[PDB]
Amino acid sequence: CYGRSMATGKLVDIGEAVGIVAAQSIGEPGTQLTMRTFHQGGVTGGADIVGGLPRVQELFEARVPRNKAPIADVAGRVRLEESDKFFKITIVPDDGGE
């Protein structure tokens, strides 16, 4: 299920620590990534998009994204309405109802 080892090129062995390899492979290049500004104080720069190490810590902790978006609860079609600054969306199921 793991597969083969990238070092040997042959199918992986029994007893091979494959979690430490994962941690290292993901962390080592962590300096090639954007980050949160290093300044003592200021305004939250998250107003703009920041999608490097922040996004990764987010996902690996499974906390709620900032620029969240809702996902379809049920397949079907969509009915879209717009008030002033508010979007309303209604999904109508193709087979079921409600």
Binding site: R36, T44, G46, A47, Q57, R63, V64, R66, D84, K85
Partner: protein, 283 residues
């Protein structure tokens, strides 16, 4: 920020068509009935009781309305312990209510002073058993059982603490009104007229919202709730301190020339303050 008050938000529909930077970020619409964060009781208008509860002669009531809750026992609620004798009386309760009023602090703020005064009162029976103490410790340490009964009664407390909650209850500002409108002597006891009477208190009108707000300035807060958040903050900071302990030390370097490390530009507190969820919302 900005605040807009009125029935129709159509006044806030101008700030948004000439200054969008606010009409969708900064401006805040409220109606006389939304002032509180958590309820929008607007349609619940009221007859001319408003005039009474909409004019500062009601402030008095509020204060007295708490005084009608700084209650004292009808008869000595007995100390339900074996090797002591009830000292709780309108005497001690009176002494301590006066002491608490005498520091000019809201109710939940002076709860602590009240309880400390009552502990030093019960110190009487803690050491005044007949003449004084009567144990083999009372020749050099007159207070072995003083501060073993009084510093243990905050642990043997359920009876003491619960029967204290009658004379100094931690009021969440919604109840002081619920059980001020239902009753009939509270209105007069605190100074209120009788029109203010009503059966269901939680059926809130437009004219009890500013009262509900002022209650939060009149009462206070717990001051001891955030006790586990300190634990979690400390443990996060410790994890960051360990992160920095992992890193290479200036004396164990295998490089050509010394250079800047992270241990001399950042500490655990700030390193941990940036991996936090640090949720942000608009004004």
């Amino acid at each position: 920020g900005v605040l807009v008050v009125g029935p129709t938000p159509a006044f806030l529909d101008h700030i948004g068509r000439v200054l969008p930077s606010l009409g969708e970020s900064d401006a805040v619409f409220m109606t006389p009935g939304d002032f509180v964060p958590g309820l929008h009781v607007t349609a619940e208008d009221t007859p001319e009781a408003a005039e009474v509860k909409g004019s500062l002669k009601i402030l008095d009531v509020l204060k007295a309305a708490v005084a009608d809750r700084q209650e004292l026992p009808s008869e000595p609620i007995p100390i339900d312990l074996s090797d002591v004798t009830m000292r709780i009386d309108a005497e001690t309760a009176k002494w301590a209510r006066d002491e608490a009023r005498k520091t000019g602090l809201p109710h939940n703020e002076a709860r602590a002073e009240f309880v400390d005064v009552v502990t030093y009162v019960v110190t009487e029976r803690a050491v005044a058993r007949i003449g004084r103490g009567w144990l083999t410790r009372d020749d050099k340490h007159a207070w072995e059982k003083m501060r073993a009964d009084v510093v243990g009664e905050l642990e043997d407390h359920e009876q003491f603490n619960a029967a204290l909650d009658a004379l100094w209850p931690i009021l969440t500002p919604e109840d002081v009104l619920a059980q001020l409108y239902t009753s009939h002597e509270r209105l007069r006891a605190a100074g209120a007229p009788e029109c203010l009477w009503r059966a269901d208190g939680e059926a809130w009108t437009v004219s009890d919202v500013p009262l509900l707000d002022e209650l939060v300035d009149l009462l206070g807060r717990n001051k001891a709730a955030d006790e586990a958040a300190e634990r979690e903050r400390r443990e996060e900071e410790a994890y960051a301190a360990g992160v920095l302990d992992l890193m290479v030390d200036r004396e164990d370097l295998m490089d050509d020339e010394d250079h800047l490390l992270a241990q001399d530009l950042i500490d655990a507190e700030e390193l941990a303050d940036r991996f936090k969820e640090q949720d942000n919302r608009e004004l």
